[PDB]
Amino acid sequence: EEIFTLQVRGRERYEILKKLNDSLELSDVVPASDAEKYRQK
């Protein structure tokens, strides 16, 4: 999945919230083994 639109005022909050949102989405698709491997280097 259900998809919501978050309204954000200004570039500063937008950039912070996009960064968080994009990070959370990345963690939903990178496999646990791949994630650990990236974290080692």
Tell me: does residue 28 bind Zn ion (CB under 5 A): yes
Does 22 belong to an annotated binding site? no
Torsion angle, alpha carbons of 26, 31, 32, 37, to 10: -90
Shortest Å, Cβ 27 to a copy of itself: 4
CA atoms within 13 A on the CB side of 39: 8
Stated length of the chain: 41
Q: Is 9 near a copy of itself (CB under 8 A)?
A: yes
Shortest Å, Cβ 40 to a copy of itself: 8
* Residue 22 makes contact with Zn ion by CB under 5 A: no
